Design an enzyme around this catalytic site. Structure first.
Site, PDB file in Angstrom:
ATOM      1  N   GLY A 263      34.935   6.649  32.065  1.00  0.00           N
ATOM      2  CA  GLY A 263      36.182   5.781  31.623  1.00  0.00           C
ATOM      3  C   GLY A 263      36.914   6.311  30.666  1.00  0.00           C
ATOM      4  O   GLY A 263      37.172   7.457  30.767  1.00  0.00           O
ATOM      5  N   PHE A 264      37.325   5.603  29.771  1.00  0.00           N
ATOM      6  CA  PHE A 264      38.498   5.968  28.984  1.00  0.00           C
ATOM      7  C   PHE A 264      37.862   6.852  27.550  1.00  0.00           C
ATOM      8  O   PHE A 264      36.924   6.173  27.138  1.00  0.00           O
ATOM      9  CB  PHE A 264      39.191   4.836  28.425  1.00  0.00           C
ATOM     10  CG  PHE A 264      40.357   5.148  27.190  1.00  0.00           C
ATOM     11  CD1 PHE A 264      41.234   6.184  27.516  1.00  0.00           C
ATOM     12  CD2 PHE A 264      40.633   4.431  26.388  1.00  0.00           C
ATOM     13  CE1 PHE A 264      42.164   6.381  26.492  1.00  0.00           C
ATOM     14  CE2 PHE A 264      41.503   4.428  25.256  1.00  0.00           C
ATOM     15  CZ  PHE A 264      42.478   5.750  25.507  1.00  0.00           C
TER      16      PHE A 264
END
Ligand code: HEC
Ligand code: HEC
Ligand code: HEC
Ligand code: HEC
Ligand SMILES: [Ca+2]
Ligand SMILES: [Ca+2]
Ligand code: NA
Ligand code: NA
Ligand code: NA
EC number: 1.4.9.1
Lengths: 125, 376, 357, 129, 376, 354
Positions: free
Chosen positions: B68-69
């Site tokens: 993800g981020f």
């Protein structure tokens, strides 16, 4: 390299978009993210669906049915992108159509596209 | 000189000629070994990212892990699992944030744990390996939290549960030394020792301040948990080495990676992962080049190699590419990994001589972080 | 020699002196006019066959002998999947081991023992001459030798070109002698891109030299009990046909309800279908597969009865990974598959396709 | 084009990485995804956190405090990426540090990075820079 | 002449000199107009994707919208909203799939609806604009489903709820013609008309078979809902036109986009969105180039412009870039948008002269789909 | 003109004859020796002031007059935020309108009416001369003109450089004449990157010409009642101080409990703090902002009482968007801020810092 020139198959490098079995591949060659010509990378799920093409093998003069299968459940590998469309028919002849994410049948309902494999399933009709 | 794709074309043609059948299936990655290298692509802040698992010997991608981020990857030094702290949102980059730890089996790459972190507690920052760290026993993952205040999160990988947040003072990075202890680097220029039992405030001790206000220590020090060696360059190539192998901080002699002359002609470290440390060789590698004092994050074309004991220069390589990050395999005759964010390519060098041996291109969008297991 | 042994099997094959009451030969149930299957009506129609006593019914449908000579002997491959053998449950290792079974099966030819078989063989001076020339003097006097020699002759006969001529339209098309109709060609395209390919093709990849449209593996596709056949066979309402698990020496409960993937050669002429002859029509057998894929209520209804297919006889170990393909066959694809499968009919049985169409 | 040369501020094009106020920008210039020099693009959330730099303005020769602010809650814009680091200090001096996602204070707890604005908030100089 | 970044610097400098205050805040996009153009970036099958909202007149990105895996964008012709059907997963590309439709305000770009689609029913395919379609009144979104069988999903945008799946025959694409009716193109060479209620078997009618089995109709026909004109090229640049404005299909005369000698010399259409149709001008634009017959998805460097009524050629533009998709603004003196997937650049041309006017680069990874609103 | 007017204002400002018992001048509460605030210890400490009657206490802390001449006249700006005005609740439009109020407020100077103010002006021959020269003959015989003229003189006196010298260290540093200390410069950096600058800076962006560390807006920062001050005011334990909503003309419920952002100039020497003088120490004032950001038990506790801060007197319209910054000020930043705020002390009050 002229993108519009007739595609010319080779049987000497499976990572290159002119490899003879990739005559109707769309996406990424699985060999380039840890699968192989006919196996999926770890972590991904092998679809049972396929679309096909009749691909000319310059090694033996014969045309083979390549029933592509997607490896699914990972974001697109981003390595060895290729799109070839030899004999590729529009979406209404789905068994020959390659924009479709052919991930059906993949374990865990995986439907994201990671790469495609190029196994042979028959000599052409 | 035959490439991997060529060798593969011949095996396939041979199987076809010989009429040899094979079942299409999910491959297993080769067992983890010293020459496995991981390359994380924070993708210049994209909301989803990729990690590439690479066989450094063959220069071959052998698997990938989605993230993800700005996730923080960690790799157990024994090769038994990898893990990351990651962050996803219910609508791509917006909506409810979930922070979580995943642990993965290093051969099937399947996740064996997915551990939610309450109250979205991760620090979101361009990737600094030591912002999230495994304890030596691989049983605990510690992650940094910046907001509302410096804090460290304790995650139990064994119980597969988040435990609690530790209040710390104004300090940064996390260097575990023990099942219950880690160091952090503080604003006042000390290191803090944070020892946490199972409950209450940790016990926090400070070292002597070991650098002035106006000496700047980079966000990417090398830390060999096995050696307990914290290698910390400053913007000028001055290198702090802190020995943490006893439970307490012993400051090693400070060393200069660049000659007094070189620094006068503009030589400064620069990049992302500017420093690598080979534990068995007790050796520091530093990405350097000629640059203005404030181009400290730009790529560097050179690597200097030096003795951690003495500070003597051992080699200076012209990398032949714009390199942002380096690291090394921890085996004998190590590879020196030179990752170019710009080229998205991991150049794989011989650490001894600096020859480029092979390279793996198409490593995502802005790959920045190299990790290796230290398995010896 | 290979010739004389097959010629002896040819005689045994059609000889009813090898049944207790002398009413039944191999050819009775494996009728060469019907692609070596049983045209005779019994208490469950054509689902199961009637033995020499004229009353006993089997619990399984009599399979074709065509192409049965191409099946490997029974084995477990490296991936732990069983393969090959003879009978729907693979319980005979190969044709030779299978051949004496119907002779001694009180439900089929019902000879009481090997010695009654040998005595019949002695009665016939052609057998004395034929067996003796191949197996030596006095062979017919030793019930064990005689019985084994008859099984060998019978397996040799089944291996001859006559049982596996490869002269189907499909074969002719694959030689370039002719082309598929457009419907056939679509049928072939679907067959090889849908899940049928995962089981009804010899190989996982590459090209087979003598394709017989089976991978020889064992799969539980979740078939119901054929009630009328099961009543006729007398095995009981509480009987479960465990498939491959019934083979002696298989103990693994994961094999319960798995049967050998049949060759689809001559499938158009060897109805009814499945190991218990449960479906009369070829189209029904193909439609059964949509029960795993289709979201439409009709996918769950056997069109031959208007009622649900039924609970699987063995609810465990279903091949869901292959069966639950995520894609339903529409009727045009079903038509195309029928047309393709009809192309798998041997030349000499092409005339029989008229009636089935 | 020489990435290691001393950075040379210009006051003529805000979409270029050498625009004077971008002297410690990290990410993407909001002006290239529908924001402006000092405003966020539609759909994003403006953080109240910032990091500061003193950026030299070639035009008046004055040095201004640029208090960068992130526009959050979208995936990175991918347009006009830039990384400059004038006066940029490491993360333990977070007020001057620019790898941090400075999305704190953004509506809806938005913490994803889309782009950065470059507003002026003072004159003044730093000991360090 | 003066770039947008140049004009901005000038104005910022003037505000500084003049002591002008201004509040940092979230901009609104300008009112949607005829020269707004949206470029979707399927990003070569990435799990997350982006749409760029562009002022075509200024050549300026005015906004962006994030999306998930191969989303289908729609733009209300009247400019009141835009929407997409999109797909996300709970762990990037793996885990629980959620398909959903979002509807966005076209100025604030805030989602005003987020409508879950049960049972992950979207067709995951390289983006075909006419696989997800708004009805003319804008209250219903229709999306195609392929698995387990062709079907169409009905989504109520006004009540913000999914409605039902409709079973259809073996047919593809969705050209809505009324609040409850759309057409599809069927494997047998007919179109199918589907008229549906809230419940009950939809009424399905087929036209005559209108092309032979060996004439291939491309995946990207242009459909002008306001004109009910379906412009469907074949691989050879033969163009089927079907008039659906009566509510039933009337087959118009076929035209050839390329001449006999062009065809004899290897000219064929190719690309992604190969055809545009300008409703007010009744004009077809087709991407063509010299190419082998199976290179039908490669870029093209020429656009032919032909009178839709007569098939008369009005222009052949040398685009001067590798173009994969074209579209046109639907105002007078339209712009011809020429999107290069390889350059990630939208080239903005005068549709009359073919001249390139301006361009918007850095549009993601693999931008392929241009959508305009027909607001006139 | 402006000079003589201011000089008249200067005389009135110190003149206790403008109070009922002639015991109190503006300067009594806005003592020049204390940055124009009230040094006088009362029932509630220094939190509120005592009027001329020696008994009445206010319910608000006497603010500095320094820099009050920089505040714009009350107005509602185009984003709908009210700005400017005088008093903590902006109920006076500008200094002129504010000046007469203490004179007639029975809790302050307690003159009964404008005539009584005029009469006292008439007793002093010096006022007849000073007023007449600026406003014309007979100005003191008309109580309306006399009182307006007095208010005008006082407002002109408050607009002199003497009230707003811009000679703090901060001013000298901004002029390049001096440098901040590392701690002060850290404090300035914190102040302009943390949420403080969203409210205590004149402008959103750009550089202010005469920075007074306030945007002149109104915000409810969620302060509790000052119990002893509220006791002393005699307004009662019911009472709710609605801040801006009490200005006549303001009807908007969103404005309840909002008070004018004070200028932080001289803040270090004008304790106690906030509209009701609830905090005696500058450090406490800064710590209060952590109640919104910090998850630490101590953030909930007022360090002067050792007890929780108190529920907001008005639990609506908190400026949560600004106040919930997501970041907590550690002791280091609080110290740094104190150092920085002390730099906003006018030259003449530098000796008061201890
Ligand atoms: C009817 C009473 C039969 C007579 C007489 C014979 N066979 Fe048969 N055959 C019959 C059935 C019901 C079955 C399946 C039974 C089961 O348990 O699966 C069979 C099967 C065979 C097979 C195996 C074929 C395959 O599995 O694909 C062979 C090779 C076979 N039969 C040959 C055979 C011979 C050689 C016979 C005379 C000796 C003979 N059968 C008689 C039904 C009947
Ligand atoms: C493995 C999971 C299979 C897939 C996928 C398909 N088939 Fe199959 N088939 C399979 C077995 C194990 C059997 C015998 C089942 C039993 O217990 O009896 C079959 C049988 C058929 C038949 C009947 C053949 C006969 O009775 O002689 C037909 C016509 C058939 N199968 C066709 C078929 C088609 C067309 C498929 C793709 C839709 C298909 N099968 C899939 C194993 C498997
Ligand atoms: C104590 C008994 C006081 C005397 C005498 C004077 N003032 Fe005052 N001042 C006092 C308080 C308690 C307050 C705040 C009251 C509130 O309701 O907010 C004030 C306020 C002012 C202001 C506004 C300052 C600002 O808002 O920033 C001004 C301009 C002011 N005071 C001036 C002033 C003059 C000119 C006086 C003599 C006529 C005078 N004050 C008397 C306390 C007391
Ligand atoms: C707007 C939401 C604000 C933010 C953010 C900060 N402050 Fe503030 N401050 C504000 C108001 C409206 C007031 C008066 C509040 C009241 O009702 O009385 C204040 C007050 C102060 C004071 C007291 C000054 C005095 O009494 O004369 C100090 C010392 C102060 N504020 C400092 C300060 C700092 C350092 C901040 C960042 C941590 C800060 N404030 C934030 C408005 C707002
Ligand atoms: Ca049968
Ligand atoms: Ca005060
Ligand atoms: Na039956
Ligand atoms: Na068994
Ligand atoms: Na009011």
């Amino acid at each position: 390299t002229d993108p519009r020139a007739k595609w010319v198959p080779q049987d000497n490098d499976i990572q290159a978009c002119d490899y003879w079995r990739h005559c109707s591949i769309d996406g990424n060659i699985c060999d380039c993210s840890g699968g192989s010509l006919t196996n999926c990378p770890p972590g991904t799920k092998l679809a049972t669906a396929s679309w096909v093409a009749s691909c000319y093998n310059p090694t033996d003069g014969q045309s083979y049915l390549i029933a592509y299968r997607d490896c699914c459940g990972y974001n697109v590998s981003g390595r060895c992108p290729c799109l070839n469309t030899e004999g590729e028919l529009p979406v209404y002849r789905p068994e020959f159509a390659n924009d479709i994410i052919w991930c059906f049948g993949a374990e865990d309902d995986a439907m994201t596209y990671h790469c495609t494999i190029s196994p042979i399933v028959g000599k052409a009709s | 000189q035959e490439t991997q794709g060529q060798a593969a074309a011949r095996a396939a043609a041979a199987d076809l000629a010989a009429g040899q059948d094979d079942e299409p299936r999910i491959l297993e990655a080769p067992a983890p070994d010293a020459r496995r290298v991981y390359v994380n692509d924070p993708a210049h802040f994209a909301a989803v990212t990729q990690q590439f698992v690479i066989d450094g010997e063959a220069g071959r991608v052998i698997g990938m892990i989605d993230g993800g981020f700005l996730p923080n990857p960690v790799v157990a030094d024994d090769g038994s699992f990898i893990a990351h702290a990651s962050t996803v949102f219910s609508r791509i980059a917006r909506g409810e944030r979930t922070d979580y730890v995943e642990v993965f089996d290093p051969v099937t790459l399947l996740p064996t744990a997915d551990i939610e972190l309450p109250d979205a507690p991760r620090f979101l920052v361009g990737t600094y390996p030591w912002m999230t760290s495994l304890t030596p026993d691989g049983k605990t993952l510690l992650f940094y939290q910046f907001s509302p205040a410096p804090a460290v999160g304790v995650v139990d990988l064994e119980g597969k549960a988040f435990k609690r947040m530790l209040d710390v003072p104004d300090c940064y990075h996390i260097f575990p030394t023990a099942p219950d202890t880690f160091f952090m680097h503080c604003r006042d220029g000390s290191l803090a020792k944070v020892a946490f039992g199972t409950e209450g405030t940790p016990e926090i001790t400070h070292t002597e301040v070991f650098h002035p206000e106006d000496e700047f220590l980079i966000n990417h020090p090398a830390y060999s948990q096995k050696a307990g060696r914290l290698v910390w360059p400053t913007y000028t190539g001055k290198i702090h080495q802190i020995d943490l192998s006893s439970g307490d901080a012993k400051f090693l002699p400070a060393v200069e990676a660049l000659t007094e002359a070189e620094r006068a002609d503009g030589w400064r470290p620069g990049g992302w992962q500017q420093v690598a440390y080979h534990r068995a060789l007790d050796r520091i590698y530093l990405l350097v080049d000629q640059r203005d004092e404030w181009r400290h994050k730009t790529a560097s074309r050179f690597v200097v190699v030096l003795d951690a004991k003495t500070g003597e220069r051992l080699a200076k390589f012209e990398m032949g590419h714009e390199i942002d990050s380096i690291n090394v395999s921890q085996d004998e005759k190590p590879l020196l990994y030179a990752l170019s964010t710009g080229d998205k390519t991991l150049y794989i060098h011989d650490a001894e001589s600096g020859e480029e041996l092979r390279s793996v291109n198409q490593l995502g969008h802005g790959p920045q972080v190299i990790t290796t297991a230290d398995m010896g | 020699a290979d010739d004389a042994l097959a010629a002896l099997g040819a005689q045994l094959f059609v000889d009813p002196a090898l049944s207790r009451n002398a009413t039944q030969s191999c050819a009775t149930c494996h009728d060469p006019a019907r692609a070596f299957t049983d045209p005779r009506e019994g208490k469950a129609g054509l689902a199961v066959s009637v033995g020499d006593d004229g009353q006993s019914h089997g619990d399984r449908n009599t399979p074709t002998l065509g192409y049965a000579a191409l099946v490997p002997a029974f084995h477990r491959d490296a991936n732990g999947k069983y393969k090959g053998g003879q009978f729907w449950d693979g319980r005979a290792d190969d044709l030779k081991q299978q051949a004496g079974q119907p002779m001694l099966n009180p439900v089929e030819m019902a000879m009481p023992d090997r010695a009654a078989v040998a005595a019949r063989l002695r009665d016939d001076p052609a057998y004395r001459t034929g067996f003796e020339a191949l197996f030596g003097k006095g062979v017919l006097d030793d019930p064990e030798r005689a019985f084994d020699a008859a099984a060998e002759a019978l397996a040799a006969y089944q291996a001859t070109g006559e049982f596996s001529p490869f002269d189907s339209k499909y074969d002719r098309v694959m030689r370039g002698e002719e082309k598929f109709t457009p419907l056939e060609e679509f049928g072939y395209t679907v067959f090889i891109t849908w899940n049928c390919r995962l089981c009804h093709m010899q190989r996982k990849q590459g090209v087979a030299e003598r394709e017989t449209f089976t991978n020889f593996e064992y799969h539980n596709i979740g078939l119901p009990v054929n009630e009328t056949a099961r009543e006729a066979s007398g095995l009981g309402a509480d009987h479960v046909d465990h498939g491959l698990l019934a083979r002696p020496g298989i103990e693994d409960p994961a094999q319960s309800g798995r049967f050998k993937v049949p060759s689809l050669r001559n499938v158009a002429v060897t109805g009814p279908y499945m190991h218990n002859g449960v479906f009369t029509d070829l189209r029904t057998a193909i439609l059964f597969y949509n029960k795993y894929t289709s979201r439409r209520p009709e996918a769950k209804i056997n069109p031959e009865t208007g009622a649900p297919w039924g609970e699987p006889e063995v609810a465990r170990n279903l091949s869901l990974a292959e069966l639950q393909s995520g894609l339903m066959l529409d009727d045009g694809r079903v038509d195309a598959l029928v047309a393709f499968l009809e192309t798998l009919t041997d030349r000499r049985y092409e005339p029989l396709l008229e009636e089935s169409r």
